[PDB]
């Protein structure tokens, strides 16, 4: 209900292009209609029923990268993401995206990332930290996996430079399907080897020898781990790795076929560090509210229950000390 709503919580898998307001993806669709960039019925037709099935949810990506990637609406929906999160009593969001390179609008990776730092710097509607609600912002630079080794590198070496305007960690994230492990370890141990955090995309796929790699890298976080086997979860639980939850991506997407089956209730009991995300409210049609209204009814727990899970959160986010501290807080004062 609407306790759920004003309780404090902390979001760690939150992509920052699919956390866009339905109405702004519209409005930059009919600008770009209006030039005839695009065709508004189309995309529109898009926008409206793709399945977003794992397969068919990468198209629509597609579509939005094609929507938002300009320095402008970056600056725009870093803002409007921000303030949607806190709006809802989010008081520390780890803000996660891929920097893009587009050379026909001198964008580069380190370009992208400065209108990211340009939206923080506008969010107005409430108070912000990022190096009346107040919300905690750092960031996270996702690899895709599509990149090379040296692709990876850059973003690794853009993440370094950020650190002085809240760049904590690397993310590697994409489509599943592709590319290989292999490619990207070179620039994850680099960067843990210079003290940023890791979190991985893990088991969003059949794919155990990968499962069993990534474990084995010893990541601060992963993300999904839907299709984890049995050497995969006693692994997982010696290392206490937290593993960030998607509920409804995990089911829309169909990695999950049930939220009465989902790992999240092993988790739970089994006493496994584990954070309720959105992964992607825009596309999903969600929102961390209500991620946990679908939580706190399949495990039926009490509000105080609750509240013990969403506190737990704290010492798996990436922040500084001085941070958490306010974080417990925060979390102590309701
Ligand atoms: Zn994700």
Partial sequence: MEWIQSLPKIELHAHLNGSIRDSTLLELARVLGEKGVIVFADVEHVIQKND????????LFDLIHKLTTDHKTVTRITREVVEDFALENVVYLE?????????????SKRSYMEA???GLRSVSEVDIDFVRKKIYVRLLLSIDRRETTESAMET?????????V?????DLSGNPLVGEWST???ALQYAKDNDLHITLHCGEVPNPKEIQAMLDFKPHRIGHACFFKDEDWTKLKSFRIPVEICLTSNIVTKSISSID??????????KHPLILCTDDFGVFSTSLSNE???????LGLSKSETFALARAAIDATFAEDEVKQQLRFIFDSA
């Avoid at 089956?261 to 089994?270: C, R, S, T, V, W």
């Fill in 95 to 107: 803000l996660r995206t891929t920097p893009k390179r587009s050379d026909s609008i001198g964008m």
């Fill in 116 to 118: 990211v730092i340009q």
């Fill in 166 to 170: 809240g760049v904590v960690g690397i």
């Fill in 261 to 270: 089956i989902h790992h999240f209730a092993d988790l739970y009991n089994a």
């Fill in 184 to 186: 990207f370890l070179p």
């Fill in 292 to 298: 946990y209204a679908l939580a706190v009814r399949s």
């Fill in 52 to 59: 977003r099935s794992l397969v068919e949810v990468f198209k």
């Fill in 156 to 164: 690794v070496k853009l993440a370094l430079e950020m650190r002085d």
